[PDB]
Design a protein around this ligand. Sequence first.
Ligand SMILES: *[C@@H]1O[C@H](CO[C@@H]2O[C@@H](C)[C@@H](O)[C@@H](O)[C@@H]2O)[C@@H](O[C@@H]2O[C@H](CO)[C@@H](O)[C@H](O)[C@H]2NC(C)=O)[C@H](O)[C@H]1NC(C)=O
Ligand SMILES: *[C@@H]1O[C@H](CO)[C@@H](O[C@@H]2O[C@H](CO)[C@@H](O)[C@H](O)[C@H]2NC(C)=O)[C@H](O)[C@H]1NC(C)=O
Ligand SMILES: *[C@@H]1O[C@H](CO)[C@@H](O[C@@H]2O[C@H](CO)[C@@H](O)[C@H](O)[C@H]2NC(C)=O)[C@H](O)[C@H]1NC(C)=O
Ligand SMILES: *[C@@H]1O[C@H](CO)[C@@H](O[C@@H]2O[C@H](CO)[C@@H](O)[C@H](O)[C@H]2NC(C)=O)[C@H](O)[C@H]1NC(C)=O
Ligand SMILES: *[C@@H]1O[C@H](CO)[C@@H](O[C@@H]2O[C@H](CO)[C@@H](O)[C@H](O)[C@H]2NC(C)=O)[C@H](O)[C@H]1NC(C)=O
Ligand SMILES: *[C@@H]1O[C@H](CO)[C@@H](O)[C@H](O)[C@H]1NC(C)=O
Ligand SMILES: *[C@@H]1O[C@H](CO)[C@@H](O)[C@H](O)[C@H]1NC(C)=O
Ligand SMILES: *[C@@H]1O[C@H](CO)[C@@H](O)[C@H](O)[C@H]1NC(C)=O
Lengths: 611, 606, 76
Amino acid sequence: APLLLYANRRDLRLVDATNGKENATIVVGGLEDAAAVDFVFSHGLIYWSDVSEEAIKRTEFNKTESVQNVVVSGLLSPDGLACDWLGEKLYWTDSETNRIEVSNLDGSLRKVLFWQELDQPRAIALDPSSGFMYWTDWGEVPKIERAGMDGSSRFIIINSEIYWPNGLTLDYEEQKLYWADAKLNFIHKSNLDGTNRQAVVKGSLPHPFALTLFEDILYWTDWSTHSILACNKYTGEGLREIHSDIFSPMDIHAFSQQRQPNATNPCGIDNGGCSHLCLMSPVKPFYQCACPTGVKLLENGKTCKDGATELLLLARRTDLRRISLDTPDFTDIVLQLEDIRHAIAIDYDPVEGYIYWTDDEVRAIRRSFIDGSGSQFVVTAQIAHPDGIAVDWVARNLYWTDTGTDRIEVTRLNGTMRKILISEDLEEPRAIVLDPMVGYMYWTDWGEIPKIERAALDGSDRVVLVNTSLGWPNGLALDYDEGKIYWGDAKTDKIEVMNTDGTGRRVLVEDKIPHIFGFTLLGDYVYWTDWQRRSIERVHKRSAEREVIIDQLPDLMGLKATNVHRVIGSNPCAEENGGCSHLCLYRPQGLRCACPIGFELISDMKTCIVP
Amino acid sequence: EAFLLFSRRADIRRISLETNNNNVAIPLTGVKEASALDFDVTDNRIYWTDISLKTISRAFMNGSALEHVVEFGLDYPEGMAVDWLGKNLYWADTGTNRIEVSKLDGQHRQVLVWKDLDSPRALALDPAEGFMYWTEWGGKPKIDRAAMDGSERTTLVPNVGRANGLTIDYAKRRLYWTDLDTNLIESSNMLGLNREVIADDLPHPFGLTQYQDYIYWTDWSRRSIERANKTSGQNRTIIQGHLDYVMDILVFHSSRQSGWNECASSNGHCSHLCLAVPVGGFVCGCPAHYSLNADNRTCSAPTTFLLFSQKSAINRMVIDEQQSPDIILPIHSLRNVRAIDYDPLDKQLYWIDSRQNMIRKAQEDGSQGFTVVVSEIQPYDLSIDIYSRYIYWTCEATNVINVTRLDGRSVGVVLKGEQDRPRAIVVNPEKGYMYFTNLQERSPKIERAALDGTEREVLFFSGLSKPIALALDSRLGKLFWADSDLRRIESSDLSGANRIVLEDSNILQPVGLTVFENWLYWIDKQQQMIEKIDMTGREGRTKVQARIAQLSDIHAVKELNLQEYRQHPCAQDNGGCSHICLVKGDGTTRCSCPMHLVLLQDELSC
Amino acid sequence: KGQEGSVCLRSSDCASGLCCARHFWSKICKPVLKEGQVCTKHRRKGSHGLEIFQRCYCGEGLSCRIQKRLHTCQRH
Ligand SMILES: *[C@@H]1O[C@H](CO[C@@H]2O[C@@H](C)[C@@H](O)[C@@H](O)[C@@H]2O)[C@@H](O[C@@H]2O[C@H](CO)[C@@H](O)[C@H](O)[C@H]2NC(C)=O)[C@H](O)[C@H]1NC(C)=O
Ligand SMILES: *[C@@H]1O[C@H](CO)[C@@H](O[C@@H]2O[C@H](CO)[C@@H](O)[C@H](O)[C@H]2NC(C)=O)[C@H](O)[C@H]1NC(C)=O
Ligand SMILES: *[C@@H]1O[C@H](CO)[C@@H](O[C@@H]2O[C@H](CO)[C@@H](O)[C@H](O)[C@H]2NC(C)=O)[C@H](O)[C@H]1NC(C)=O
Ligand SMILES: *[C@@H]1O[C@H](CO)[C@@H](O[C@@H]2O[C@H](CO)[C@@H](O)[C@H](O)[C@H]2NC(C)=O)[C@H](O)[C@H]1NC(C)=O
Ligand SMILES: *[C@@H]1O[C@H](CO)[C@@H](O[C@@H]2O[C@H](CO)[C@@H](O)[C@H](O)[C@H]2NC(C)=O)[C@H](O)[C@H]1NC(C)=O
Ligand SMILES: *[C@@H]1O[C@H](CO)[C@@H](O)[C@H](O)[C@H]1NC(C)=O
Ligand SMILES: *[C@@H]1O[C@H](CO)[C@@H](O)[C@H](O)[C@H]1NC(C)=O
Ligand SMILES: *[C@@H]1O[C@H](CO)[C@@H](O)[C@H](O)[C@H]1NC(C)=O
């Protein structure tokens, strides 16, 4: 007696028995807007997606409440869901982020498979027997696609006679795959290639939402009629509708251990496949090696590196996000954190892996471990508009500017030992960068006469680097072992470059530049935000040419491209803090020790006390 | 004691001649951007221009009596001076290129200089001698002089940059000014000769004034008010520091406004304006477009003139050999005019506000304003029947020809149709017909009918795409129309015979027509021009005015022949009719009614 | 497009023979200078920032040079 399992917006539901007594059982319930479901039968698992909660979840078939969040981030319209009962993975399409991804059956080791040339991918079917997953994306040009469940050999099989190509489901007995259509109102049928496209229920009668099957019988939903239907597997004949008066049936599967035929796993319980991900594959070994998103795989294969090497950190108004720079996929932002009101400036310390950032409604500086409970506060007192912040990763101090109080101030990274280095009456400090070797700190500031100044790392030797033809200078990156210093200006709308001493000057490109501007450099590339702050460009600093790595991301405020862990440069401050008991501030001549407000430097020129 | 007054954007302030002394703002209200500044010590009053408000205002030193004296036809009133003797207000506008004058309270405004003006900036008066001086900031800056009536204009000093703070040392007969291009303060006698440089080592001099043996100036760079020996340029001290954006400065003392002339006494017996002149003491003046009567003392308003409206203004211009400047009528009610007409009987101006969707009324004075149609209603065009005292108008919403009395009460609809869409309309009550454009979908046409809606007929249905304006000449029985799409002006007999194209070249967008004597005036929205052709063809197409933005309508006003007017059978008692009074071919009158009424046995009542 | 005196924001908002120059505390369309016409020459860099009565540049094939003290638009 085939049990049918189906989503229902408000709950997941199991029905059929032997098609009698109308025992539709509310498997899970109290959901909000459920779309897709699936199961791994052996483990007694039921998964679904929720479009209002933008999460994918799972429960235990037994009498229990047990529900676990499985994905709860990075999702917009997960409308297709397929469990891999063999390789033990979870696949799912998202029709609005236009991605296709995979994870372990606990949401972990989450890898993005495909993300290019996808228009509203929906229905999804796995063939763990082979290494083939099938799905349908539809849009300006609809199509059904095949590829390996490993990310390989993306083949377009059916690309004609389709419009809104509908539910996918495969006959393992016959090595044929069926599909429907939410517009042209047919059911078809082919071989697992694009081959032998036969009609099973041609003619405009079926208006199926989701197809399944069990022993010669095609079942499906027609939301309109609020019904479930069924007919011969071979012709349209037999077309009765199973008992169904159901409040918006969506996704549906035959809930039967027979619809998941078990077999040999391409990796054993041995190996566990690789180090992170063993995905099934058509390729000879029949399994393949994978790392999570943004993580590259060693030349040996089978072993994933540790995390990303470079990394592009975003600050939006109300969240932080990181894009990796190790992989082509890019637009995999991923975020974190709580109580972020209005983020402005961002920076990072590779040594301890703390992200530092400013928020100018909260009026505070904070730090975190990325996707880590890093979160502590750092500064919260006497702050106005922290429009720029810089980590000194050698002396282990934190610099930040302030627009409301027109100051530059330094503290140790933990916000201890605060000391005002610069406080100008007219001009007001905005964006700031550091050179802990060479002992310079450069910064843009606005004002009646907008200039770009520089000084030693204690504010001592003020030199005005740039003075003329600058309206509102914004970003300010630093190319180190090339001695150039890149910046922008909102008023004039052009990104210029310069010699480290203020001489090699020249427009690099013209650009319409936002007032709050994200702008950073790392490895030949420059990254900035567009005029509408919904997109980020990658530009060659040596080659001048532009590119857009991610759009449709509003409220971008500030960026920082950075190595993770990797650190460069040094000076004697790194030696037990220069011998200074509090603040050690490096200069070209040589370090100078300083003190928090109220303290006094003794003739040691090394020590502070309270008088 | 003599004290110093200066304008400073949002406020006007007073200080003493003493260094670092107290600096107090005159308690004024609603000042946005004060620029030009003068005073009237005898009346204890200050006058200032606001280039943001586009106005000239005055008030007492105690801030009381804040009133606007000029609030129309201003663009950039950068220059302004008080004639304390004749009690007149002079001002210059760099945007409108005009030097104007009026009474100190603002009435009887008149244009003194309008030709060959290229940005008049600063203005200094010498009513005792009958001369006025001003600086000019064109391609070739200069300092000109003229009689205080605008006569005898001549350049006094030609070799100068943008001069400012033009001030006269009356006692010692000299002129001082700053130069914004050479950063110096110069001086010369009242003839522009004996030209000396008082100070040259100045970074950014702007304002200027003098009193006794010192000159005071402002400096935008040093943010200051400094003074120095007026002849030497030395013994320099700073009076005030840290002053941002000091526009104009002046010395408030009685000794600055002395002297006398024939105008100070009974206003020279002048009916309106008393204007001092060097040779002859003074001359009597009149408001714009007014004529000075044979008595050399009184004025008469213009009898015939031409009205052209824009989006935000209605202008009047006369046809003189002198080419007198057009002026903006001071109607406060104006916002978005779409069409204009004029009742010569009561001498009042009618227009349609396209935004507030009403037909308003007011005399050229701007006073006696009154709404005659309000609301759905969406008036498109109007045509006044001056005999029956009726307005025939068209509604873009209900697609009808509606007729309303001048006082506000309705007569009724005279034309309504399922597929009919009346737009442009002109009534010819002398013959008993009305003419209008009927913009039916995909087949535009020009029609005629009796003033009651009967005897409809199509005059023209081909050679049309956008019949956009109508005009007729009752005396010559001619009809004129303009087509926006076909870019041409056509003519015909009232009957519709003898259709002839008048002009079909170098036209882009005609939107208004009007007959003035033997000429056909029309306005081109895109070309931004007023042009005219001779209906007789004897003389050639002539440009009247260029660079007029957002032209909406133009309308000729001829002097009403009261006697010839009363000859009309509907002139009095409306021909004994209750509603519409039609004129038979034999000069006899019937009575008709709107669409909703019927003529009774009285053959007079509806 | 913008005519002389018309409020503008960029020279592109103005007509062919005009540029967007500031007058007081907004910008309006002003005409380009022609041969013989007086042009602006700033002494101090800062005087440029303070100018509220801005002239347009010299027209095509004209250079702002000194007379042979004012500066006028002259041909190369
Ligand atoms: C503000 O001042 C006006 C007018 O100035 C007055 O008269 C000047 C000639 C000069 O003597 C000033 O010091 C005077 O203040 C005042 O208007 C006058 O008010 C008085 C008394 O009410 C009245 O008799 C006059 O006719 C008014 N007009 C003139 C021209 O004298 C006005 O009262 C003052 N306002 C305030 C609030 O004090
Ligand atoms: C479930 O599938 C697994 C994987 O095929 C089966 O486990 C073993 O599979 C190998 C592969 O051929 C067989 O040789 C063994 O005989 C299987 N285990 C044994 C000893 O039974 C497993 O049999 C399947 N479960 C069932 C019974 O359906
Ligand atoms: C951050 O604060 C910690 C304590 O919360 C500081 O740790 C030591 O503090 C003492 C007291 O001034 C100093 O003498 C030591 O030098 C600090 N240790 C180190 C590592 O230098 C610490 O100074 C602050 N920041 C650092 C440097 O960790
Ligand atoms: C920005 O402007 C200031 C002030 O004009 C420059 O400082 C001095 O400028 C004068 C000329 O105005 C020179 O004679 C000096 O040589 C400048 N200072 C010195 C001694 O270097 C300043 O140089 C300008 N900023 C830059 C460097 O572009
Ligand atoms: C024609 O004009 C008259 C006004 O001149 C309009 O008459 C108004 O009609 C409304 C009803 O729709 C009454 O409430 C108003 O009181 C009337 N106004 C006056 C002053 O009488 C009329 O609406 C216009 N159009 C038509 C089609 O009749
Ligand atoms: C101004 O200069 C003149 C001569 O240059 C001199 O007679 C006079 O004393 C100076 N100052 C004053 C206050 O008059
Ligand atoms: C002005 O300066 C001159 C010398 O430069 C001096 O002789 C004279 O006394 C000063 N003041 C007056 C009022 O003359
Ligand atoms: C008007 O002026 C003329 C010319 O000066 C003069 O002949 C005539 O007498 C004057 N009329 C008067 C004063 O009534």
